[PDB]
From a paper:
Recognition of viral antigens by CD8+ T cells requires successful folding of the major histocompatibility class I (MHC-I) molecule and β2-microglobulin (β2 m) with peptides typically 8- to 10-mer in length. The peptide binding groove of MHC-I molecule contains six binding pockets, A-F, which span and accommodate the binding peptide from the N-terminal to C-terminal. A minimum 8-mer peptide is required for structural stability of the peptide-human leukocyte antigen (pHLA) tri-complex that is contributed by two amino acid residues of the peptide that serve as “anchors”, one that fits in pockets A/B and the other in pocket F4–6. The overall structure of HLA-A*11:01 in complex with various peptides (SSCSSCPLSK, SSCPLSK or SSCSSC + SSCPLSK) is similar to the standard MHC class I molecules.
For HLA-A*11:01-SSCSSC + SSCPLSK complex, the two short peptides were clearly seen as separate entities that were ordered and displayed continuous electron density. However, insufficient electron density for the residues SSC in SSCPLSK peptide of the combitope did not allow for precise definition. Superimposing the Cα-atoms of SSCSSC from the combitope (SSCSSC + SSCPLSK) with 10-mer peptide revealed the orientation of residues to be similar in both structures with a r.m.s.d. of 0.3 Å. Overlaying the Cα-atoms of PLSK from the combitope with 10-mer peptide showed a r.m.s.d. of 1.6 Å. The P7-Pro of the combitope is flipped outwards from the antigen-binding cleft by 5.8 Å in comparison to 10-mer peptide, and the side chain of P8-Leu in the combitope is orientated in the opposite direction to the 10-mer peptide. Close examination of the combitope (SSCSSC + SSCPLSK) revealed that the N-terminal peptide, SSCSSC, has its anchor residue P2-Ser seated in B pocket of antigen-binding cleft and is held by various hydrogen and van der Waals interactions. P2-Ser interacts with residues Tyr7, Glu63 and Asn66 in a fashion similar to 10-mer peptide but without water-mediated interactions. As for the C-terminal peptide (SSCPLSK) of the combitope, it is held firmly in the antigen-binding cleft by primary anchor residue P10-Lys that makes interactions with Asp74, Asp77, Thr80, Tyr84, Asp116, Thr143 and Lys146 in a similar manner to the 10-mer peptide. However, the side chain of P10-Lys in the combitope makes an additional water-mediated interaction with residue Ala117 which likely contributed to the overall stability of the complex.
Numbering used by the authors:
A (entry chain D): 1 to 4
B (entry chain B): 1 to 99
C (entry chain C): 1 to 6
D (entry chain A): 1 to 274
Write the structure that this text describes.
Amino acid sequence: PLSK
Amino acid sequence: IQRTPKIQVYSRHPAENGKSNFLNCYVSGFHPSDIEVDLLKNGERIEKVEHSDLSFSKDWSFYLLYYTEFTPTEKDEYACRVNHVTLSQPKIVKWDRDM
Amino acid sequence: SSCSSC
Amino acid sequence: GSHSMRYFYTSVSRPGRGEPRFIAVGYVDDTQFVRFDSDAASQRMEPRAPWIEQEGPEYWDQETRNVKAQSQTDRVDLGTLRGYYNQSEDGSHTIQIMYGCDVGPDGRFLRGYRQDAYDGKDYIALNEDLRSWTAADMAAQITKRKWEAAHAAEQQRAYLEGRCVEWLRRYLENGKETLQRTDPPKTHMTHHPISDHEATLRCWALGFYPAEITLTWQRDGEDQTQDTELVETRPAGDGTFQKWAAVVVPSGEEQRYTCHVQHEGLPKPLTLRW
């Protein structure tokens, strides 16, 4: 995280 | 979306033949970041050239400074050769001492 | 100092 | 006056040539102070200004951890965005991230930024309120929704309003001799006949810091903006910058043209006339  | 480099070729200080100086080639406004920049003395690639760490502007376009210590003479011609995907052949830009 | 939690 | 701290991250995929390359650089105002290059041998965040070298090993370990974690995140994101835009596995792509904060003369937080690109174009950006996001297109809307759900904005604001500013203040104090200096431009004119009836006048600004500067040409007091050749402000390589502006003048009319130089380092704007 914070993944796209 | 590719963008071709702007290229300036110049010395750190106003050139004086026989006085040590730095030859710069500044490339900017380009995308993608993959690029090759060579400094040429009388058409021959100078071996020892360093460059700044990759960064980019507000518009996302990349910029790099390539540079080498040198001592200009009246005989020696200098140029910056830039190789980038937007250019079907390498662009060679000659050093003019008043640009 | 860079961000750790980004 | 005001000051900024900015981090710039670039990740580039290189299919079937292993891992993406990741480069980070950090700046305070126009001065670079750290870098990281995933391909270099050290695998460490490194110093690039003198004043940062006083940070101890805990600093460098943490900074190194940060950037290595961002590179792994970008690695996965490069695959995700390729999927969102239905792109082949074969092409190279680029994710870029710029973030940072601005402080005023008194050191107080003015503003915070975090903005992301995909292939050199806006992807997603934290709005000035630091609570909401702007998505450029439908792919970035997917990200935006994930980021809203994960409360991403709250994490980033806390960094931008806290550590970002605190460290910028630290660096401004510890590097005060260079970061808080102004180097006024050293100016001169050059002049080259083009024919018997035209000549170039070129106005030079050298050795200046910070990069921001204004060079203008006037004829009889009238701005010649539309007839002025400017070059992009450029690095000298020693931490100062250079710029020039030129006009083509009908030969013999040089005394009518004045070059005007504005810079934070000058007690007053300079005028030059050939």
